[PDB]
């Protein structure tokens, strides 16, 4: 590919940034389930 317009960039990143939170959230569940059933 190529770079993006400043507009389509910012609009991609919107998605990159929910991706992440979806991750994070699921992580949290994990880490807690972990934390929970675990010597840690």
């Amino acid at each position: 590919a190529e770079v993006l317009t400043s507009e389509q960039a910012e609009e991609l990143h919107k998605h990159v940034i929910d991706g992440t939170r979806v991750f994070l959230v699921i992580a949290a569940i994990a880490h807690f389930l972990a934390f929970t059933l675990t010597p840690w």
Binding site: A1, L4, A9, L12, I17, F23, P39
Partner: protein
């Protein structure tokens, strides 16, 4: 968040799969670590 203009500098067609890959790699590493410096991980698999 504040950083979306990076795709104006870096071709998401290479850069995204980059990020997502390094995540996948990182998670295996972190597993690998914990697996080899606890007993209780490995214990789990038994």
């Amino acid at each position: 968040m504040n950083q979306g203009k990076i795709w104006t500098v870096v071709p998401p067609a290479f850069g995204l799969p980059l990020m997502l890959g390094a995540v996948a790699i990182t998670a295996l590493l972190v597993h690998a670590a914990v697996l080899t410096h606890t007993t209780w991980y490995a214990a789990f698999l038994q």
